[PDB]
Design an enzyme around this catalytic site. Structure first.
Site, PDB file in Angstrom:
ATOM      1  CE  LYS A  21     -12.061  -5.176 -49.573  1.00  0.00           C
ATOM      2  NZ  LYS A  21     -10.662  -5.565 -49.928  1.00  0.00           N
ATOM      3  NE  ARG A  91     -12.764  -5.730 -52.907  1.00  0.00           N
ATOM      4  CZ  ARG A  91     -13.586  -4.794 -52.416  1.00  0.00           C
ATOM      5  NH1 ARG A  91     -13.572  -3.559 -52.905  1.00  0.00           N
ATOM      6  NH2 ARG A  91     -14.430  -5.080 -51.428  1.00  0.00           N
ATOM      7  N   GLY A 100      -6.636   0.332 -45.904  1.00  0.00           N
ATOM      8  CA  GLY A 100      -5.471   0.495 -46.762  1.00  0.00           C
ATOM      9  C   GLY A 100      -4.146  -0.158 -46.396  1.00  0.00           C
ATOM     10  CG  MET A 102      -3.191  -6.743 -45.814  1.00  0.00           C
ATOM     11  SD  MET A 102      -4.359  -8.004 -45.266  1.00  0.00           S
ATOM     12  CE  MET A 102      -5.790  -6.987 -44.884  1.00  0.00           C
ATOM     13  NE  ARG A 336     -13.508  -0.057 -44.309  1.00  0.00           N
ATOM     14  CZ  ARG A 336     -12.321  -0.193 -44.905  1.00  0.00           C
ATOM     15  NH1 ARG A 336     -11.794  -1.397 -45.023  1.00  0.00           N
ATOM     16  NH2 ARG A 336     -11.656   0.856 -45.387  1.00  0.00           N
ATOM     17  CG  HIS A 454      -7.462   3.363 -47.729  1.00  0.00           C
ATOM     18  ND1 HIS A 454      -6.720   2.535 -48.554  1.00  0.00           N
ATOM     19  CD2 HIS A 454      -8.759   3.005 -47.890  1.00  0.00           C
ATOM     20  CE1 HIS A 454      -7.543   1.710 -49.178  1.00  0.00           C
ATOM     21  NE2 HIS A 454      -8.781   1.971 -48.798  1.00  0.00           N
ATOM     22  NE  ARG A 560       6.089   7.696  -9.266  1.00  0.00           N
ATOM     23  CZ  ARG A 560       6.570   8.728  -9.957  1.00  0.00           C
ATOM     24  NH1 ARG A 560       5.799   9.790 -10.204  1.00  0.00           N
ATOM     25  NH2 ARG A 560       7.828   8.700 -10.400  1.00  0.00           N
ATOM     26  CD  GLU A 744       7.522  -3.111  -7.139  1.00  0.00           C
ATOM     27  OE1 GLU A 744       7.544  -2.495  -8.224  1.00  0.00           O
ATOM     28  OE2 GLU A 744       7.775  -2.558  -6.048  1.00  0.00           O
ATOM     29  CB  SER A 763      -0.451  -2.704  -5.238  1.00  0.00           C
ATOM     30  OG  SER A 763      -0.966  -1.744  -6.149  1.00  0.00           O
ATOM     31  CB  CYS A 830      -1.058   0.772  -9.861  1.00  0.00           C
ATOM     32  SG  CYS A 830       0.500   0.478  -8.949  1.00  0.00           S
ATOM     33  CE1 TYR A 850      -5.953  -0.768  -6.398  1.00  0.00           C
ATOM     34  CE2 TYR A 850      -7.302  -2.297  -5.154  1.00  0.00           C
ATOM     35  CZ  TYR A 850      -6.146  -1.563  -5.290  1.00  0.00           C
ATOM     36  OH  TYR A 850      -5.181  -1.634  -4.303  1.00  0.00           O
TER      37      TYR A 850
END
Ligand SMILES: Nc1ncnc2c1ncn2[C@@H]1O[C@H](COP(=O)(O)OP(=O)(O)NP(=O)(O)O)[C@@H](O)[C@H]1O
Ligand SMILES: Nc1ncnc2c1ncn2[C@@H]1O[C@H](COP(=O)(O)OP(=O)(O)NP(=O)(O)O)[C@@H](O)[C@H]1O
Lengths: 872, 872
Positions: A21, A91, A100, A102, A336, A454, A560, A744, A763, A830, A850
């Site tokens: 701002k 402000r 909108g 704050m 903005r 807003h 899966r 995992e 993975s 994944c 990936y």
């Protein structure tokens, strides 16, 4: 040192100090533009405050007041002075945009006397009090806790009693009156205390409470939605007022130099004859089309017109702009980069690039990776739409086909949606207080507030249909009903909206699949070109496959294989094995699965066409495959010839305190190497032939879940190979095929250098690694999880977004280690994280090959790849 | 390389290479004892062998036969010859002493032909032929897999048909008889392949086997108990054979240089004329006391004695020695530090330390710390024992009160101790194969076997009671009965075993607490003098503090809070609380426990006498503090205005799939800080009061569980710090306190640096951490762990021995990152790894201020924290 800065003293490249701002405010000034003069307390103060224990050091306070004096001097009026008083606005604004979220306070420094000065100095008493009711209104609502409805209803009940429809219709009588009541509201709400008369009180009071804004409930919502560290803080802007409540040739507007729904070139916005900025931004009063201000003020608009295309150029991006005309003299308060739809998001980029203002690199970069989900939201069926029962039609605030069941607040709509319900929320005003709702809901219907409000900018943002300013709605809030068209709608009833026509509908309208447009595709060639991570897809069926492949995905990352075991033609064969006492008995019964799953693997490979697939060997525990119903236990016990008290004994036996951590996965494969071998054969025999059948080559990947000790996976992979080796010798196939692992479980990661001795690939299923790392399971978690967000303890959904700081350390370590032992090691992600762009970048950064995502997220992954590269 | 060393080519220090039994034949040979000259193929061969796809290389093979040739030269007999053959023992003995967990073969080098040349030479066919059925036996079993169940029956089908009661009684022709049937037995299972008559091929085939032994199933189990690393393997020894089975002047045996159970000083061990060692060793016959060898041939006695005393002296440790008289001559075969009980192992050291032969330090380092568990084993109630119906009695081969239900096979015994029975094993003999049983058995009862037996010794080291060699018993393995004095017994019948008298008892004799010798007390001194670690306890009650204390326990490291609701007068309140409709309803219901709990702490505070206590707040999910039965459910409703529909409404909802990873612990106080306060109040009030009364200073540690985020623990901590200062204001108290955090979620040790900023201590709750670093539960890990140990996947039990490799990583990382922000940072560990020596060392070494183990494991922590202080 310097806690206080002057707009002129600053520039856009000073954003972290003064915000977006005051850094564009300063910028606008330094551009020479008609920007009301003020200063900024920097986000450092905000911080100092929390560490000055929600207070302002004697030092930072003198600088404020010292600077104020400076504004007086320039203006020629003193602060909250008696006769000819200086009037300010207080402000907020963070480092980033959170429309909108704050708060801001307007007309600060009108006391009980100065309003009389003001009235007399402007010779306009209607105006004085409107601005004074407005102070007590905004100030008390924000600095204290006294809610709007009060003021909203009082300002209501009074236009009723007075028989007026518009604010511009109240006498200075009613406003002075209202002034009295608004301070009655205050003095009341706070056990005695009366509204602060000294502007040095008012001033300090606002600055503080605007720092506080930082942690509004709704602000903590927008920040999670958009990955904003709750610690940044906010600067407080103190700006000398310019008044729009001063009559017909005075008034306030906001605008987007281009369409933020459609993406289209040319001004877009609203304006409100004789009004302060709030009514418009704050979704409180429905304003008219910008064409008005063009028509009926051909000059101030031509001026506005130019300056808008300036800012567009100066910032090289489509701008949302707050402005006020005070008596025919236009003023720019804010600018903005407008929050826009994804459809819009994209159109603009191609446009700006096409024109020549931005490169193909700047485009891919600016686009908000996530908004792409919008592009596949289902739209209405034309015929159904064309037959739906119109009941009304308001503003096309946000695009989208939203059919759902109405709720009258947010918390409810959210709960209804978090049940399974498709919710449409119905609200008096278009508010950022209702952000919990707007997000939940398929759609949003309001009586008042404009597209420039807003909420709207923000709704266009998230991807929520909106239709606002439907002043033909009555809201019956004790009855929890509402009236429009001819009927009254009960909570839960189906309405349906169209954030494109604007036309509203009783009922619930059909939706077909949606088309992917041009610019999308243009954009999609650039990312695809600049990215270096491949975009996989979590997908378990040829059909899921074709969908991702169509979006533009490169393989299945996670496929899966639990459904191959579940299905009627399937579930018996496995059930048999579990109740088999002999090992050959277990072999024997799983075998009867092989023609089935091999036919699955062929159907996949057919859909696949030479793209890689990481097939996931049997994950969960046997007890997920047994009958917990006695009906189907007795049946089963006959199907083989046992007493129901054996099958019941088996389940009982296989049953588990914690399923998340049973004899499942790689621990299963071990005691029952048979399942391992069975899936090996299907994959291999399905692969081999579909290559022999199609001519296109296949290199099977085989993935083993829930590993954590090298020797463990060792034992397991030794099985698979043999089976792959025999199926090969039989067929007489030379076929390459990889065996790798799921990382995992932390220890799997922590020892990635051991595991990598075996795993040809890694993975990362952080879905599961995040459970193990955090100690909570996805499901039961929700129980605390929300109580956490609202309390700022977790500023992101660990299951929605890869927690880099913790879970992430493991991800990296498992790469740094896995690769030390095996440098040409491929890694993927994944999870659900595989499609969150924070996760996606980070994955590009710690060295992934990936990421894999849900079919309909592939493009979030692809653009999120595009940007992960460019940004490094 | 030199894969082969003559006995003369070695010494004590070549233990890792010569193996144990290597460096000893070498050591002893150098000291020049009557060791039969053989030679040692190195442990590196074992490795090379394994590595070489489990085959022997040319150079190894070459290196063997070359010494086999050196072996001939001294013996003046061409190896396994036909006229005057060389007969060898092929023996196994790792760098570690795993008594009889390893195979060895006697008399290799014999065949139909060579056997005859022997009897012509030795001029003794009954002997000549006995030793060829021996070799035929011990070969067929070890290299192939033919069981003693077989051989040991045709032998008995002969001692019945030939009508003799002893093995001695058998004419050379029964042996000519017994010999072939054995080969008949061998070939039967070898596909029409007979016994090898190749003094060469017999050798290589024998070695291969002896290398394979290291992975013997009993072995593996034994390596899991005494923490031996699974990669060391075994060296192999081919030694010249001397003959205990020649005549009335020959014989074999073994004798400890002190009572290995009761640590009593002097010779202890048995003897048997006319047999080779394996008879006594394999617990296949019952030997007589060595007192025998004292009358028969007192030169050989006196020869033996001297060398036993020279043997203890040389190793400064109670030796375990093996000898074989071949016709009036003595021949030392073996020696090792004598596996003893915890009793004896304390005794000797104190004695050795007296006498003047080992240092006070030393005394400590070489007591198997973990063994002190036997120490606290309960002693047969003396009055209840004076009643005990003694039926029979035999060798007290291992001490202790053994009592429980009997089974006939190791697994029937273990599988009974799984369900949770207290089992007693009942065997024909004491054999090192019956181990799963010796472990799970409260004691053991065998018809035949000695106190100088294999299993016997392993029984004593474990702390497991063993009454061996009870000639009376007759096992009916079919019906699973045995007939002993009184009656015949059925699989499961209760009996007791005074292992300290070898007196048997019909019935399940009552037991009682045990005390600690002044010998334990002496060592405990030498512990403290030397350890750096402090030691606390896992204690919930004053009884168990007082207990822990007196055992050595300094303060308490983990007081659980749960029973404070668990209990009778407590549960209604938390039950009242769960069902509370309002926070107000809570606080209300909650404050009612404060009185109960407040004393529950004042209680522990007069018990600690200033000792510090770590107070875990509430950990489990509320669904634990409710009635899980439907009768149960309703009864509480009637008491709080509700109905089944309302109870189940809760009890249903409170349900979690995985409650280990549930809304529990730290996550509870987040949404219900009302408890944190309550708990903070019950503690804070009680502390001062007791601190003020006794006049002893008290400084509360308070520990939050399931913390994995920094902000997360501060919120709970902030709640704590208010209530704490509210009580301190009330009572005019200056009582300092400390707020720490468990570390049991992996995301805490990861972000240690962040956590320590809020937490004043780390406490390592190793157990869920393990469960989460491994991704699995302990309550559920039965179903695969067995495979894993057997398959060598896991070497140790991860829920008992701290996993330094994987889990240890987070620990270090925790103390590092943690202390990087709070240098003074105290951290202690409370798992079940706090009473594992191995675990304790790693803790010592990394920097944990202390260890805390259950009250009855405090003497293990003590000693182990003492050993690890030194040995580091
Ligand atoms: N000094 C001022 N004089 C006149 N109008 C002002 C002044 N400052 C702010 N406003 C207007 O009052 C309204 C609120 O100010 P603002 O700080 O922009 O908060 P907001 O627009 O409601 N939320 P945001 O735009 O995201 O910061 C806007 O319409 C402004 O244009
Ligand atoms: N060359 C030999 N001559 C006579 N007896 C022997 C000879 N070699 C070994 N023995 C004896 O045969 C028995 C068994 O051999 P051994 O290699 O010691 O295995 P173990 O004692 O049964 N178990 P362990 O102590 O762990 O090695 C012992 O009693 C020895 O004393």
């Amino acid at each position: 040192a310097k806690w206080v800065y002057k707009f002129e003293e600053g520039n856009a490249s000073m954003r972290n100090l003064l915000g977006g701002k005051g850094c564009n405010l300063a910028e606008m000034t330094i551009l020479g533009m008609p920007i009301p003069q003020g200063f900024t307390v920097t986000t450092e103060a905000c911080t100092e405050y929390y560490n000055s224990g929600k207070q302002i050091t004697q030092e930072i306070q003198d600088q404020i007041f010292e600077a104020i004096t400076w504004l007086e001097e320039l203006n020629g009026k003193k602060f909250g002075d008696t006769e000819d008083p200086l009037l300010v606005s207080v402000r907020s604004g963070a480092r980033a945009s959170m429309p909108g979220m704050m708060d801001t306070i307007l007309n600060l420094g009108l006391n009980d006397v100065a309003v009389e000065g003001f009235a007399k100095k402007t010779g306009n008493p209607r105006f004085a009090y409107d601005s004074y009711r407005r102070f007590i209104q905004m100030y008390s609502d924000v600095v204290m806790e006294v809610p709007k409805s009060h003021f909203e209803k009082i300002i209501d009940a009074m236009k009723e009693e007075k028989g007026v429809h518009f604010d511009t219709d109240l006498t200075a009588d009613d406003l002075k009156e209202l002034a009295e009541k608004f301070k009655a509201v205050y003095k009341e709400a706070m056990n005695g205390e009366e509204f602060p008369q000294e502007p040095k009180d008012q001033l300090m009071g606002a600055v503080k409470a605007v720092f506080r804004s930082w942690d509004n409930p709704r602000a903590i919502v927008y920040r999670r939605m958009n990955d904003i560290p709750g610690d940044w803080g906010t600067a407080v802007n103190v700006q000398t007022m310019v008044f729009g409540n001063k009559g017909e040739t005075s008034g306030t507007g906001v605008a987007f130099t281009r369409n933020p729904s459609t993406g289209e070139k040319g001004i877009y916005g609203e304006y409100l004859i004789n009004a302060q900025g709030e009514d418009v931004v704050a979704g409180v009063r429905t304003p008219q089309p910008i064409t008005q201000l063009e028509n009926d003020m051909p000059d101030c608009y031509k001026q506005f017109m130019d300056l808008a295309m300036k800012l567009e150029k100066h910032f090289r991006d489509m701008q949302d702009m707050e402005f006020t005309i005070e008596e025919g003299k236009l003023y720019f308060l804010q600018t903005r980069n407008g929050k826009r739809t994804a459809p819009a998001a994209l159109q603009i980029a191609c446009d700006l690039v096409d024109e020549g203002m931005i490169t193909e690199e700047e485009a891919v970069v600016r686009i908000e990776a996530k908004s792409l989900d919008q592009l596949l939201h289902p739209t209405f069926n034309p015929a159904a739409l064309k037959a739906g029962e119109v009941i009304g039609s308001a503003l096309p605030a946000s695009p989208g086909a939203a059919a759902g069941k109405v709720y009258f607040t947010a918390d409810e709509a959210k709960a209804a949606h978090e049940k399974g319900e498709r919710v449409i929320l119905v609200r008096l005003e278009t508010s950022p207080e209702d952000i919990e709702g707007m997000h939940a809901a398929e759609g949003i219907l309001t009586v008042r507030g404009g597209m420039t409000s807003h909420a709207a900018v923000v709704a266009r943002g998230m991807g929520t249909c909106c239709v606002s300013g439907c002043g033909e709605i009555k809201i019956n809030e004790e009855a929890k009903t509402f009236e429009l068209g001819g009927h009254t709608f009960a909570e839960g009833d189906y309405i349906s909206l169209d954030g494109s026509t604007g036309k509203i509908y009783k009922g619930d309208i059909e939706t077909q699949e949606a088309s992917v447009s041009g610019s999308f595709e243009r954009i999609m060639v650039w990312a695809d070109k600049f990215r270096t991570l491949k975009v996989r897809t979590n997908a378990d069926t040829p059909e899921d496959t074709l969908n991702a492949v169509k979006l533009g995905a490169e393989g299945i990352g996670l496929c899966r294989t639990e459904h191959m075991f579940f299905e009627a033609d399937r579930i018996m064969k496995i059930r048999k094995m579990i109740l088999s006492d002999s090992v050959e008995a277990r072999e024997e019964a799983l075998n009867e699965l092989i023609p089935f799953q091999k036919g699955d693997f062929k159907a996949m490979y057919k859909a696949l066409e030479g793209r890689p697939m990481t097939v996931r060997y049997l994950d969960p525990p046997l007890h997920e495959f047994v009958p917990h119903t006695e009906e189907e236990q007795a049946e089963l016990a006959k199907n083989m010839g046992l007493t129901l008290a054996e099958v019941k004994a088996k389940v009982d036996e296989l049953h588990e305190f914690n399923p998340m951590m049973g004899h499942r996965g790689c621990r299963l494969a071990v005691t029952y190497p048979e399942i391992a071998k069975m899936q090996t054969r299907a994959v291999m025999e399905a692969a081999i032939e579909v290559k022999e059948e199609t001519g296109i080559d296949i290199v099977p990947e085989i993935m083993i879940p829930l590993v954590g000790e090298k020797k463990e996976l060792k034992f397991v992979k030794d099985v698979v190979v043999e089976v792959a080796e025999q199926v090969k010798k039989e067929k007489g196939s030379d076929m390459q095929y990889h065996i790798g692992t799921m990382i995992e479980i932390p220890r799997a990661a922590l020892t990635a250098d051991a595991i990598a001795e075996e795993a040809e690939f890694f993975s990362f299923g952080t879905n599961d690694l995040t459970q193990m790392t955090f100690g909570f399971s996805r499901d039961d978690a929700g129980k605390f999880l929300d109580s956490y967000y609202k309390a700022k303890i977790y500023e992101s959904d660990p299951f929605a977004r890869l927690d880099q700081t913790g879970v992430g350390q493991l991800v990296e370590m498992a790469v740094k280690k896995g690769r030390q032992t095996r440098p040409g090691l491929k890694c993927g992600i994944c999870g659900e994280h595989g499609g969150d762009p924070s996760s996606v970048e980070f994955c590009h950064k710690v060295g992934l090959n990936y990421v894999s995502c849900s079919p309909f997220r592939v493009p979030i992954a692809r653009l999120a790849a595009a940007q992960a590269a460019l940004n490094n």
